[PDB]
Amino acid sequence: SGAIYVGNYRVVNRHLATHNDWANLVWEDSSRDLLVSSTTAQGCDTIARCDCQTGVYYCSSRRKHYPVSFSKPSLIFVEASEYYPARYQSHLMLAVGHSEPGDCGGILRCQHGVVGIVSTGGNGLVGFADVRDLLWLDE
């Protein structure tokens, strides 16, 4: 679990969004595993606007942060799960690192701010849904 809070928006994994997230829906994209809902309280986070390929992410299944080198956002095949059919997930960045069910929502950050959130795992890999292209989150 986990979310990004920026301005009057909350960014979560689409497959973990709550009834309240859906009742206050701003935008969602099943192909990216993202959903953004509106909030009344002002958010605590700032979004990176950069091309960094190194950063640090929080891994809840280890209660630790790990440094990673990750690929540029791209279209990557993801195996079927209880949440999605087998499909290509877009705007996804892969890295070598630990991730298991329960780790989705952990934040990936670089020196400029929030880059994205954990969205895929297994096989000693961790995949992050990029949010750096969502410029409207900042206004």
Ligand X SMILES: COc1ccccc1[C@@H](OC)C(=O)N1CCC[C@H](C(N)=O)C1
Q: Which residues are catalytic?
A: 15, 33, 104
Q: Binding of ligand X at residue 84 (CB under 6 A)? A: yes
Binding residue numbers for Zn(2+): 50, 52, 110, 112
Question: Considering beta carbons, is residue 15 or 65 the nearer one to ligand X?
Answer: 15
SS3 label, residue 139: coil
Q: Please provide the DSSP assignment of 38-90 as one string.
A: E-SSPPS--B--S---EEEEEETTTTEEEEEE-PPSEEEEE---SSS-SEEEE
Q: Binding of ligand X at residue 100 (CB under 6 A)? A: yes
Q: Binding of ligand X at residue 45 (CB under 6 A)? A: no
Q: What are phi and psi of 109, to 5 degrees?
A: -130, 150
Q: Binding of ligand X at residue 81 (CB under 6 A)? A: yes
Q: Nearest-CA neighbor of 102 among 132, 62, 139?
A: 62
Choosing among ligand X, Zn ion, none, which partner's interface includes residue 37 (Cβ < 5 to 8 Å by kind)?
A: none
Tokens 């079927």 correspond to what residue? 80
Choosing among ligand X, Zn ion, none, which partner's interface includes residue 105 (Cβ < 5 to 8 Å by kind)?
A: none
Q: What residues make contact with Zn ion under the rule CB under 5 A?
A: 48, 50, 52, 110, 112
